[PDB]
């Protein structure tokens, strides 16, 4: 469909849209696509990719925050806070897992990733220090009992409910609509 290849060619490659604001629904749709939000892990874990995704997630959180300025969607607000913090913490957790599984461990990117996205959390991450550098064999199943501790299914749920909650609040309070 050259008449759509034209549109993508504009967005990815045109002067007027390089330096232009990117609206929230693009980042929403990006999250939905990236994490396959639907009613199970074809997620691509790369620190470039995941950091980008977390950046758009954060972007959504900020727009949601600022835009929130009888109903009491305070409840929706605090709900969205719970969901966001647990979702982001989860994504960073699983990304850390994916970093760990590889041998040798690229640990400067690892630590960096945990200094950009692991500060909304606590200090159990020092635990990660000492498991940053014990040897792989004890660790991979020190790590892999955790997906029946915290299977991805539940973070898929948390993310999906963060999104639907978010675009609910936005659709109701603010002048937003999402259906074609």
């Amino acid at each position: 469909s050259s008449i759509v290849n034209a549109c993508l060619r504009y967005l990815g490659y045109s002067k007027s849209m390089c330096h232009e604001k990117m609206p929230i629904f693009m980042d929403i749709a990006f999250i939905e696509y990236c994490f396959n939000l639907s009613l199970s892990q074809q997620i691509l874990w790369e620190y470039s990719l995941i950091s980008n995704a977390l950046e758009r997630l954060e972007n959504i959180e900020l727009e949601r925050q600022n835009c929130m300025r009888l109903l009491n969607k305070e409840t929706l607000n605090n709900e969205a806070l719970k969901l966001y913090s647990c979702a982001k913490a989860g994504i960073c957790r699983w990304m850390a897992f994916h970093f760990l599984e590889q041998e040798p461990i690229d640990h400067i990117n690892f630590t960096k990733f945990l200094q950009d996205w692991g500060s909304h959390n606590e200090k159990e991450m020092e635990a990660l220090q000492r498991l940053s550098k014990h040897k792989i064999r004890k660790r991979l199943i020190y790590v892999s009992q955790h997906k029946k501790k915290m299977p991805w299914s539940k973070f898929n749920s948390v993310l999906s409910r963060y999104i639907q909650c978010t675009k609910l609040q936005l659709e109701v309070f603010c002048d937003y609509d999402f259906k074609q």
Binding site: G12, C18, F30, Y33
Partner: peptide, 30 residues
């Protein structure tokens, strides 16, 4: 006054989005 506009290079939030999008999609494809 951006040096990537200067250089005729793709430098956009849209660009980063789409490119990430298709890295994911070709992760899907094979």
């Amino acid at each position: 006054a951006c040096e990537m506009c200067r250089l005729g290079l793709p430098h956009g939030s849209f660009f980063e989005l789409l490119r990430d999008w298709k890295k994911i999609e070709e992760f899907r494809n094979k």
